[PDB]
Amino acid sequence: FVKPGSLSVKVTDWGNTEYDVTLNLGGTYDWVVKVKLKDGSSVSSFWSANKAEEGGYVVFTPVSWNRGPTATFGFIATGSESVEAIYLYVDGQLWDAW
């Protein structure tokens, strides 16, 4: 990882699971967070970011005001802890991963 410490994740499970993500970038970037979910799961809710489903991953990008230095966003995925991995990409490089 290029910048360990740039990705922080809080998980809350009640049947469906909420992932509250904080990005510590040190500046404003067009970050890209790629999320891999277990088969059968999907994102049912999200905020403070744009969402796209591409190539088998759920891709989150910043809204106008959430490019950094510290960006916070979140989403809810169906099922209990269905997120298998979260990757933070900045300018094409893998900065951190969960």
PDB file of N, CA and C in Angstrom:
ATOM      1  N   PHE A   1       0.861  -1.218   0.000  1.00  0.00           N
ATOM      2  CA  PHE A   1       0.000   0.000   0.000  1.00  0.00           C
ATOM      3  C   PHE A   1       0.880   1.245   0.000  1.00  0.00           C
ATOM      4  N   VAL A   2       0.539   2.205  -0.853  1.00  0.00           N
ATOM      5  CA  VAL A   2       1.303   3.443  -0.968  1.00  0.00           C
ATOM      6  C   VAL A   2       1.169   4.361   0.242  1.00  0.00           C
ATOM      7  N   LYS A   3      -0.043   4.441   0.795  1.00  0.00           N
ATOM      8  CA  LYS A   3      -0.296   5.299   1.939  1.00  0.00           C
ATOM      9  C   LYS A   3      -1.115   4.634   3.047  1.00  0.00           C
ATOM     10  N   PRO A   4      -0.531   3.642   3.744  1.00  0.00           N
ATOM     11  CA  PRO A   4      -1.295   2.989   4.814  1.00  0.00           C
ATOM     12  C   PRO A   4      -1.746   4.018   5.839  1.00  0.00           C
ATOM     13  N   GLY A   5      -3.026   3.952   6.190  1.00  0.00           N
ATOM     14  CA  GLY A   5      -3.576   4.919   7.121  1.00  0.00           C
ATOM     15  C   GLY A   5      -4.566   5.853   6.449  1.00  0.00           C
ATOM     16  N   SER A   6      -4.670   5.768   5.126  1.00  0.00           N
ATOM     17  CA  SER A   6      -5.601   6.623   4.401  1.00  0.00           C
ATOM     18  C   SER A   6      -7.024   6.063   4.362  1.00  0.00           C
ATOM     19  N   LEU A   7      -7.194   4.790   4.719  1.00  0.00           N
ATOM     20  CA  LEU A   7      -8.521   4.161   4.723  1.00  0.00           C
ATOM     21  C   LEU A   7      -8.918   3.652   6.115  1.00  0.00           C
ATOM     22  N   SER A   8     -10.050   4.130   6.630  1.00  0.00           N
ATOM     23  CA  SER A   8     -10.557   3.698   7.941  1.00  0.00           C
ATOM     24  C   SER A   8     -12.004   3.242   7.770  1.00  0.00           C
ATOM     25  N   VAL A   9     -12.323   2.111   8.382  1.00  0.00           N
ATOM     26  CA  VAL A   9     -13.646   1.519   8.229  1.00  0.00           C
ATOM     27  C   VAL A   9     -14.322   1.072   9.521  1.00  0.00           C
ATOM     28  N   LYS A  10     -15.575   1.487   9.694  1.00  0.00           N
ATOM     29  CA  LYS A  10     -16.378   1.078  10.851  1.00  0.00           C
ATOM     30  C   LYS A  10     -17.515   0.224  10.297  1.00  0.00           C
ATOM     31  N   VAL A  11     -17.723  -0.937  10.914  1.00  0.00           N
ATOM     32  CA  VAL A  11     -18.749  -1.883  10.486  1.00  0.00           C
ATOM     33  C   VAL A  11     -19.826  -2.085  11.548  1.00  0.00           C
ATOM     34  N   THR A  12     -21.089  -1.992  11.145  1.00  0.00           N
ATOM     35  CA  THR A  12     -22.205  -2.170  12.081  1.00  0.00           C
ATOM     36  C   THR A  12     -23.224  -3.094  11.426  1.00  0.00           C
ATOM     37  N   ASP A  13     -23.485  -4.224  12.075  1.00  0.00           N
ATOM     38  CA  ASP A  13     -24.353  -5.265  11.535  1.00  0.00           C
ATOM     39  C   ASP A  13     -25.614  -5.514  12.363  1.00  0.00           C
ATOM     40  N   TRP A  14     -26.768  -5.409  11.713  1.00  0.00           N
ATOM     41  CA  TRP A  14     -28.058  -5.666  12.381  1.00  0.00           C
ATOM     42  C   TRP A  14     -28.940  -6.562  11.512  1.00  0.00           C
ATOM     43  N   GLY A  15     -28.344  -7.216  10.517  1.00  0.00           N
ATOM     44  CA  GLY A  15     -29.124  -8.039   9.595  1.00  0.00           C
ATOM     45  C   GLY A  15     -28.621  -7.602   8.234  1.00  0.00           C
ATOM     46  N   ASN A  16     -28.515  -6.286   8.093  1.00  0.00           N
ATOM     47  CA  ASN A  16     -27.890  -5.667   6.918  1.00  0.00           C
ATOM     48  C   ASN A  16     -26.734  -4.947   7.595  1.00  0.00           C
ATOM     49  N   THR A  17     -25.713  -4.590   6.833  1.00  0.00           N
ATOM     50  CA  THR A  17     -24.528  -4.012   7.432  1.00  0.00           C
ATOM     51  C   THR A  17     -24.109  -2.659   6.898  1.00  0.00           C
ATOM     52  N   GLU A  18     -23.867  -1.741   7.825  1.00  0.00           N
ATOM     53  CA  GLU A  18     -23.442  -0.394   7.487  1.00  0.00           C
ATOM     54  C   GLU A  18     -21.930  -0.270   7.550  1.00  0.00           C
ATOM     55  N   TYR A  19     -21.368   0.362   6.529  1.00  0.00           N
ATOM     56  CA  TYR A  19     -19.935   0.596   6.452  1.00  0.00           C
ATOM     57  C   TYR A  19     -19.723   2.096   6.401  1.00  0.00           C
ATOM     58  N   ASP A  20     -19.119   2.622   7.457  1.00  0.00           N
ATOM     59  CA  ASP A  20     -18.835   4.043   7.545  1.00  0.00           C
ATOM     60  C   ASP A  20     -17.357   4.171   7.256  1.00  0.00           C
ATOM     61  N   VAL A  21     -17.050   4.873   6.175  1.00  0.00           N
ATOM     62  CA  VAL A  21     -15.682   5.012   5.713  1.00  0.00           C
ATOM     63  C   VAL A  21     -15.118   6.414   5.837  1.00  0.00           C
ATOM     64  N   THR A  22     -13.905   6.517   6.369  1.00  0.00           N
ATOM     65  CA  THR A  22     -13.241   7.809   6.457  1.00  0.00           C
ATOM     66  C   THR A  22     -11.926   7.694   5.725  1.00  0.00           C
ATOM     67  N   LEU A  23     -11.701   8.646   4.830  1.00  0.00           N
ATOM     68  CA  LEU A  23     -10.478   8.690   4.056  1.00  0.00           C
ATOM     69  C   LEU A  23      -9.616   9.837   4.557  1.00  0.00           C
ATOM     70  N   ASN A  24      -8.378   9.512   4.891  1.00  0.00           N
ATOM     71  CA  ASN A  24      -7.423  10.485   5.379  1.00  0.00           C
ATOM     72  C   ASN A  24      -6.411  10.635   4.244  1.00  0.00           C
ATOM     73  N   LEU A  25      -6.686  11.564   3.324  1.00  0.00           N
ATOM     74  CA  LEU A  25      -5.838  11.768   2.157  1.00  0.00           C
ATOM     75  C   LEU A  25      -4.772  12.850   2.230  1.00  0.00           C
ATOM     76  N   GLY A  26      -4.949  13.818   3.125  1.00  0.00           N
ATOM     77  CA  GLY A  26      -3.975  14.889   3.248  1.00  0.00           C
ATOM     78  C   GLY A  26      -4.117  15.958   2.177  1.00  0.00           C
ATOM     79  N   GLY A  27      -5.113  15.795   1.311  1.00  0.00           N
ATOM     80  CA  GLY A  27      -5.355  16.751   0.244  1.00  0.00           C
ATOM     81  C   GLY A  27      -6.616  16.371  -0.506  1.00  0.00           C
ATOM     82  N   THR A  28      -6.976  17.144  -1.528  1.00  0.00           N
ATOM     83  CA  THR A  28      -8.175  16.857  -2.311  1.00  0.00           C
ATOM     84  C   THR A  28      -7.829  16.028  -3.546  1.00  0.00           C
ATOM     85  N   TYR A  29      -8.514  14.897  -3.693  1.00  0.00           N
ATOM     86  CA  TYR A  29      -8.270  13.980  -4.800  1.00  0.00           C
ATOM     87  C   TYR A  29      -9.556  13.392  -5.350  1.00  0.00           C
ATOM     88  N   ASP A  30      -9.485  12.901  -6.581  1.00  0.00           N
ATOM     89  CA  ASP A  30     -10.628  12.240  -7.182  1.00  0.00           C
ATOM     90  C   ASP A  30     -10.419  10.777  -6.807  1.00  0.00           C
ATOM     91  N   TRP A  31     -10.628  10.480  -5.530  1.00  0.00           N
ATOM     92  CA  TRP A  31     -10.441   9.125  -5.039  1.00  0.00           C
ATOM     93  C   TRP A  31     -11.450   8.138  -5.594  1.00  0.00           C
ATOM     94  N   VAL A  32     -11.075   6.864  -5.546  1.00  0.00           N
ATOM     95  CA  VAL A  32     -11.923   5.788  -6.022  1.00  0.00           C
ATOM     96  C   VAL A  32     -11.868   4.662  -5.005  1.00  0.00           C
ATOM     97  N   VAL A  33     -13.017   4.322  -4.433  1.00  0.00           N
ATOM     98  CA  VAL A  33     -13.072   3.232  -3.471  1.00  0.00           C
ATOM     99  C   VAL A  33     -13.827   2.077  -4.119  1.00  0.00           C
ATOM    100  N   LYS A  34     -13.151   0.941  -4.262  1.00  0.00           N
ATOM    101  CA  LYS A  34     -13.742  -0.243  -4.868  1.00  0.00           C
ATOM    102  C   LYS A  34     -14.083  -1.257  -3.796  1.00  0.00           C
ATOM    103  N   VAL A  35     -15.338  -1.688  -3.793  1.00  0.00           N
ATOM    104  CA  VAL A  35     -15.833  -2.628  -2.800  1.00  0.00           C
ATOM    105  C   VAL A  35     -16.274  -3.944  -3.426  1.00  0.00           C
ATOM    106  N   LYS A  36     -15.818  -5.047  -2.839  1.00  0.00           N
ATOM    107  CA  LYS A  36     -16.183  -6.381  -3.301  1.00  0.00           C
ATOM    108  C   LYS A  36     -17.168  -6.969  -2.299  1.00  0.00           C
ATOM    109  N   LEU A  37     -18.341  -7.360  -2.780  1.00  0.00           N
ATOM    110  CA  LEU A  37     -19.368  -7.940  -1.921  1.00  0.00           C
ATOM    111  C   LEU A  37     -19.495  -9.437  -2.162  1.00  0.00           C
ATOM    112  N   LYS A  38     -19.978 -10.161  -1.158  1.00  0.00           N
ATOM    113  CA  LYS A  38     -20.197 -11.594  -1.314  1.00  0.00           C
ATOM    114  C   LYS A  38     -21.330 -11.752  -2.322  1.00  0.00           C
ATOM    115  N   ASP A  39     -21.335 -12.854  -3.065  1.00  0.00           N
ATOM    116  CA  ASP A  39     -22.382 -13.075  -4.055  1.00  0.00           C
ATOM    117  C   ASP A  39     -23.757 -13.035  -3.405  1.00  0.00           C
ATOM    118  N   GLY A  40     -24.700 -12.376  -4.068  1.00  0.00           N
ATOM    119  CA  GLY A  40     -26.044 -12.283  -3.534  1.00  0.00           C
ATOM    120  C   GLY A  40     -26.303 -11.017  -2.739  1.00  0.00           C
ATOM    121  N   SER A  41     -25.245 -10.288  -2.405  1.00  0.00           N
ATOM    122  CA  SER A  41     -25.396  -9.053  -1.648  1.00  0.00           C
ATOM    123  C   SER A  41     -25.356  -7.848  -2.580  1.00  0.00           C
ATOM    124  N   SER A  42     -25.962  -6.753  -2.139  1.00  0.00           N
ATOM    125  CA  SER A  42     -25.966  -5.530  -2.922  1.00  0.00           C
ATOM    126  C   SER A  42     -26.022  -4.340  -1.978  1.00  0.00           C
ATOM    127  N   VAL A  43     -25.624  -3.179  -2.479  1.00  0.00           N
ATOM    128  CA  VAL A  43     -25.663  -1.967  -1.677  1.00  0.00           C
ATOM    129  C   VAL A  43     -27.085  -1.437  -1.744  1.00  0.00           C
ATOM    130  N   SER A  44     -27.710  -1.276  -0.584  1.00  0.00           N
ATOM    131  CA  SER A  44     -29.082  -0.785  -0.526  1.00  0.00           C
ATOM    132  C   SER A  44     -29.175   0.699  -0.192  1.00  0.00           C
ATOM    133  N   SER A  45     -28.109   1.253   0.376  1.00  0.00           N
ATOM    134  CA  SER A  45     -28.100   2.667   0.727  1.00  0.00           C
ATOM    135  C   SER A  45     -26.680   3.227   0.715  1.00  0.00           C
ATOM    136  N   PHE A  46     -26.547   4.502   0.367  1.00  0.00           N
ATOM    137  CA  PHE A  46     -25.243   5.156   0.382  1.00  0.00           C
ATOM    138  C   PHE A  46     -25.423   6.660   0.475  1.00  0.00           C
ATOM    139  N   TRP A  47     -24.380   7.339   0.939  1.00  0.00           N
ATOM    140  CA  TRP A  47     -24.435   8.782   1.107  1.00  0.00           C
ATOM    141  C   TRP A  47     -23.052   9.410   1.023  1.00  0.00           C
ATOM    142  N   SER A  48     -23.030  10.686   0.635  1.00  0.00           N
ATOM    143  CA  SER A  48     -21.813  11.483   0.525  1.00  0.00           C
ATOM    144  C   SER A  48     -20.839  10.994  -0.536  1.00  0.00           C
ATOM    145  N   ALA A  49     -21.365  10.276  -1.517  1.00  0.00           N
ATOM    146  CA  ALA A  49     -20.549   9.751  -2.597  1.00  0.00           C
ATOM    147  C   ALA A  49     -21.447   9.329  -3.741  1.00  0.00           C
ATOM    148  N   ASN A  50     -20.834   9.100  -4.897  1.00  0.00           N
ATOM    149  CA  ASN A  50     -21.553   8.620  -6.066  1.00  0.00           C
ATOM    150  C   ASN A  50     -21.275   7.121  -6.089  1.00  0.00           C
ATOM    151  N   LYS A  51     -22.238   6.338  -6.561  1.00  0.00           N
ATOM    152  CA  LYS A  51     -22.075   4.894  -6.629  1.00  0.00           C
ATOM    153  C   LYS A  51     -22.268   4.360  -8.041  1.00  0.00           C
ATOM    154  N   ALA A  52     -21.414   3.414  -8.416  1.00  0.00           N
ATOM    155  CA  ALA A  52     -21.490   2.768  -9.715  1.00  0.00           C
ATOM    156  C   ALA A  52     -21.166   1.294  -9.507  1.00  0.00           C
ATOM    157  N   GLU A  53     -21.852   0.422 -10.235  1.00  0.00           N
ATOM    158  CA  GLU A  53     -21.598  -1.009 -10.142  1.00  0.00           C
ATOM    159  C   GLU A  53     -20.891  -1.380 -11.432  1.00  0.00           C
ATOM    160  N   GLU A  54     -19.591  -1.640 -11.339  1.00  0.00           N
ATOM    161  CA  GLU A  54     -18.809  -1.961 -12.525  1.00  0.00           C
ATOM    162  C   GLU A  54     -17.840  -3.114 -12.331  1.00  0.00           C
ATOM    163  N   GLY A  55     -17.840  -4.024 -13.298  1.00  0.00           N
ATOM    164  CA  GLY A  55     -16.941  -5.162 -13.273  1.00  0.00           C
ATOM    165  C   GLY A  55     -16.985  -6.081 -12.071  1.00  0.00           C
ATOM    166  N   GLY A  56     -18.114  -6.127 -11.372  1.00  0.00           N
ATOM    167  CA  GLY A  56     -18.214  -6.997 -10.212  1.00  0.00           C
ATOM    168  C   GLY A  56     -17.896  -6.298  -8.902  1.00  0.00           C
ATOM    169  N   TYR A  57     -17.601  -5.006  -8.978  1.00  0.00           N
ATOM    170  CA  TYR A  57     -17.297  -4.221  -7.786  1.00  0.00           C
ATOM    171  C   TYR A  57     -18.261  -3.058  -7.652  1.00  0.00           C
ATOM    172  N   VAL A  58     -18.388  -2.538  -6.437  1.00  0.00           N
ATOM    173  CA  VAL A  58     -19.222  -1.371  -6.209  1.00  0.00           C
ATOM    174  C   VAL A  58     -18.175  -0.269  -6.109  1.00  0.00           C
ATOM    175  N   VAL A  59     -18.286   0.725  -6.983  1.00  0.00           N
ATOM    176  CA  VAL A  59     -17.318   1.809  -7.034  1.00  0.00           C
ATOM    177  C   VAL A  59     -17.868   3.124  -6.507  1.00  0.00           C
ATOM    178  N   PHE A  60     -17.202   3.658  -5.489  1.00  0.00           N
ATOM    179  CA  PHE A  60     -17.610   4.917  -4.891  1.00  0.00           C
ATOM    180  C   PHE A  60     -16.617   6.009  -5.252  1.00  0.00           C
ATOM    181  N   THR A  61     -17.153   7.178  -5.582  1.00  0.00           N
ATOM    182  CA  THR A  61     -16.342   8.334  -5.927  1.00  0.00           C
ATOM    183  C   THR A  61     -16.911   9.538  -5.181  1.00  0.00           C
ATOM    184  N   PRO A  62     -16.096  10.580  -4.993  1.00  0.00           N
ATOM    185  CA  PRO A  62     -16.573  11.758  -4.267  1.00  0.00           C
ATOM    186  C   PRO A  62     -17.582  12.663  -4.935  1.00  0.00           C
ATOM    187  N   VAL A  63     -18.451  13.239  -4.110  1.00  0.00           N
ATOM    188  CA  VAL A  63     -19.384  14.238  -4.605  1.00  0.00           C
ATOM    189  C   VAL A  63     -18.525  15.507  -4.578  1.00  0.00           C
ATOM    190  N   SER A  64     -19.043  16.605  -5.107  1.00  0.00           N
ATOM    191  CA  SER A  64     -18.282  17.852  -5.199  1.00  0.00           C
ATOM    192  C   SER A  64     -17.474  18.296  -3.991  1.00  0.00           C
ATOM    193  N   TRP A  65     -18.061  18.169  -2.813  1.00  0.00           N
ATOM    194  CA  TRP A  65     -17.443  18.636  -1.588  1.00  0.00           C
ATOM    195  C   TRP A  65     -16.683  17.625  -0.749  1.00  0.00           C
ATOM    196  N   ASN A  66     -16.588  16.388  -1.230  1.00  0.00           N
ATOM    197  CA  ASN A  66     -15.982  15.325  -0.435  1.00  0.00           C
ATOM    198  C   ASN A  66     -14.708  14.729  -1.011  1.00  0.00           C
ATOM    199  N   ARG A  67     -13.885  15.565  -1.639  1.00  0.00           N
ATOM    200  CA  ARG A  67     -12.633  15.100  -2.240  1.00  0.00           C
ATOM    201  C   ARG A  67     -11.465  15.053  -1.257  1.00  0.00           C
ATOM    202  N   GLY A  68     -11.669  15.580  -0.053  1.00  0.00           N
ATOM    203  CA  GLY A  68     -10.614  15.580   0.948  1.00  0.00           C
ATOM    204  C   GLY A  68     -10.445  16.943   1.598  1.00  0.00           C
ATOM    205  N   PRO A  69      -9.417  17.140   2.443  1.00  0.00           N
ATOM    206  CA  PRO A  69      -8.382  16.181   2.850  1.00  0.00           C
ATOM    207  C   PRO A  69      -8.897  14.964   3.612  1.00  0.00           C
ATOM    208  N   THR A  70      -9.968  15.153   4.377  1.00  0.00           N
ATOM    209  CA  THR A  70     -10.573  14.060   5.129  1.00  0.00           C
ATOM    210  C   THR A  70     -11.992  13.901   4.602  1.00  0.00           C
ATOM    211  N   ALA A  71     -12.252  12.769   3.959  1.00  0.00           N
ATOM    212  CA  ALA A  71     -13.563  12.503   3.388  1.00  0.00           C
ATOM    213  C   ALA A  71     -14.269  11.388   4.140  1.00  0.00           C
ATOM    214  N   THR A  72     -15.552  11.581   4.404  1.00  0.00           N
ATOM    215  CA  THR A  72     -16.335  10.574   5.095  1.00  0.00           C
ATOM    216  C   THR A  72     -17.588  10.271   4.292  1.00  0.00           C
ATOM    217  N   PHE A  73     -17.854   8.984   4.094  1.00  0.00           N
ATOM    218  CA  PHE A  73     -19.051   8.559   3.382  1.00  0.00           C
ATOM    219  C   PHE A  73     -19.449   7.209   3.936  1.00  0.00           C
ATOM    220  N   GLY A  74     -20.567   6.669   3.477  1.00  0.00           N
ATOM    221  CA  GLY A  74     -20.963   5.376   3.992  1.00  0.00           C
ATOM    222  C   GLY A  74     -21.957   4.685   3.101  1.00  0.00           C
ATOM    223  N   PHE A  75     -22.187   3.412   3.388  1.00  0.00           N
ATOM    224  CA  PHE A  75     -23.148   2.642   2.625  1.00  0.00           C
ATOM    225  C   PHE A  75     -23.638   1.475   3.458  1.00  0.00           C
ATOM    226  N   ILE A  76     -24.756   0.903   3.036  1.00  0.00           N
ATOM    227  CA  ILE A  76     -25.318  -0.253   3.709  1.00  0.00           C
ATOM    228  C   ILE A  76     -25.425  -1.347   2.664  1.00  0.00           C
ATOM    229  N   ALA A  77     -24.929  -2.533   3.000  1.00  0.00           N
ATOM    230  CA  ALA A  77     -24.990  -3.677   2.100  1.00  0.00           C
ATOM    231  C   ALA A  77     -25.934  -4.696   2.728  1.00  0.00           C
ATOM    232  N   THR A  78     -26.648  -5.443   1.896  1.00  0.00           N
ATOM    233  CA  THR A  78     -27.584  -6.430   2.410  1.00  0.00           C
ATOM    234  C   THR A  78     -26.847  -7.622   3.000  1.00  0.00           C
ATOM    235  N   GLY A  79     -27.408  -8.173   4.070  1.00  0.00           N
ATOM    236  CA  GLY A  79     -26.790  -9.317   4.711  1.00  0.00           C
ATOM    237  C   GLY A  79     -25.821  -8.936   5.813  1.00  0.00           C
ATOM    238  N   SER A  80     -25.314  -9.955   6.495  1.00  0.00           N
ATOM    239  CA  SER A  80     -24.382  -9.785   7.599  1.00  0.00           C
ATOM    240  C   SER A  80     -22.929  -9.780   7.129  1.00  0.00           C
ATOM    241  N   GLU A  81     -22.268  -8.637   7.305  1.00  0.00           N
ATOM    242  CA  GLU A  81     -20.871  -8.456   6.917  1.00  0.00           C
ATOM    243  C   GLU A  81     -20.568  -9.059   5.551  1.00  0.00           C
ATOM    244  N   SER A  82     -21.256  -8.559   4.531  1.00  0.00           N
ATOM    245  CA  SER A  82     -21.078  -9.066   3.178  1.00  0.00           C
ATOM    246  C   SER A  82     -19.891  -8.475   2.414  1.00  0.00           C
ATOM    247  N   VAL A  83     -19.279  -7.416   2.941  1.00  0.00           N
ATOM    248  CA  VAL A  83     -18.124  -6.830   2.261  1.00  0.00           C
ATOM    249  C   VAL A  83     -16.890  -7.696   2.490  1.00  0.00           C
ATOM    250  N   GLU A  84     -16.287  -8.156   1.399  1.00  0.00           N
ATOM    251  CA  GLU A  84     -15.101  -8.998   1.490  1.00  0.00           C
ATOM    252  C   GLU A  84     -13.818  -8.181   1.463  1.00  0.00           C
ATOM    253  N   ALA A  85     -13.838  -7.057   0.751  1.00  0.00           N
ATOM    254  CA  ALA A  85     -12.658  -6.200   0.659  1.00  0.00           C
ATOM    255  C   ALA A  85     -13.010  -4.795   0.189  1.00  0.00           C
ATOM    256  N   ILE A  86     -12.202  -3.825   0.609  1.00  0.00           N
ATOM    257  CA  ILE A  86     -12.385  -2.432   0.219  1.00  0.00           C
ATOM    258  C   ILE A  86     -11.013  -1.920  -0.204  1.00  0.00           C
ATOM    259  N   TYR A  87     -10.941  -1.343  -1.400  1.00  0.00           N
ATOM    260  CA  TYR A  87      -9.684  -0.824  -1.932  1.00  0.00           C
ATOM    261  C   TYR A  87      -9.768   0.676  -2.178  1.00  0.00           C
ATOM    262  N   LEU A  88      -8.742   1.408  -1.753  1.00  0.00           N
ATOM    263  CA  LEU A  88      -8.695   2.851  -1.975  1.00  0.00           C
ATOM    264  C   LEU A  88      -7.653   3.164  -3.041  1.00  0.00           C
ATOM    265  N   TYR A  89      -8.121   3.713  -4.156  1.00  0.00           N
ATOM    266  CA  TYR A  89      -7.255   4.089  -5.262  1.00  0.00           C
ATOM    267  C   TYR A  89      -7.230   5.595  -5.434  1.00  0.00           C
ATOM    268  N   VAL A  90      -6.030   6.141  -5.576  1.00  0.00           N
ATOM    269  CA  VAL A  90      -5.856   7.569  -5.788  1.00  0.00           C
ATOM    270  C   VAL A  90      -4.870   7.718  -6.939  1.00  0.00           C
ATOM    271  N   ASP A  91      -5.323   8.383  -7.997  1.00  0.00           N
ATOM    272  CA  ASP A  91      -4.514   8.602  -9.187  1.00  0.00           C
ATOM    273  C   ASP A  91      -3.943   7.300  -9.746  1.00  0.00           C
ATOM    274  N   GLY A  92      -4.757   6.247  -9.708  1.00  0.00           N
ATOM    275  CA  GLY A  92      -4.347   4.957 -10.236  1.00  0.00           C
ATOM    276  C   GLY A  92      -3.510   4.066  -9.338  1.00  0.00           C
ATOM    277  N   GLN A  93      -3.123   4.562  -8.166  1.00  0.00           N
ATOM    278  CA  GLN A  93      -2.311   3.771  -7.246  1.00  0.00           C
ATOM    279  C   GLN A  93      -3.137   3.280  -6.065  1.00  0.00           C
ATOM    280  N   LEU A  94      -2.816   2.085  -5.582  1.00  0.00           N
ATOM    281  CA  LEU A  94      -3.515   1.518  -4.436  1.00  0.00           C
ATOM    282  C   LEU A  94      -2.920   2.120  -3.168  1.00  0.00           C
ATOM    283  N   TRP A  95      -3.643   3.057  -2.567  1.00  0.00           N
ATOM    284  CA  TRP A  95      -3.183   3.721  -1.354  1.00  0.00           C
ATOM    285  C   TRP A  95      -3.355   2.901  -0.080  1.00  0.00           C
ATOM    286  N   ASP A  96      -4.468   2.179   0.021  1.00  0.00           N
ATOM    287  CA  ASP A  96      -4.734   1.399   1.219  1.00  0.00           C
ATOM    288  C   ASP A  96      -5.831   0.393   0.896  1.00  0.00           C
ATOM    289  N   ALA A  97      -5.981  -0.620   1.743  1.00  0.00           N
ATOM    290  CA  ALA A  97      -7.013  -1.626   1.524  1.00  0.00           C
ATOM    291  C   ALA A  97      -7.445  -2.258   2.839  1.00  0.00           C
ATOM    292  N   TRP A  98      -8.680  -2.752   2.854  1.00  0.00           N
ATOM    293  CA  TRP A  98      -9.274  -3.374   4.031  1.00  0.00           C
ATOM    294  C   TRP A  98      -9.708  -4.794   3.676  1.00  0.00           C
TER     295      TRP A  98
END
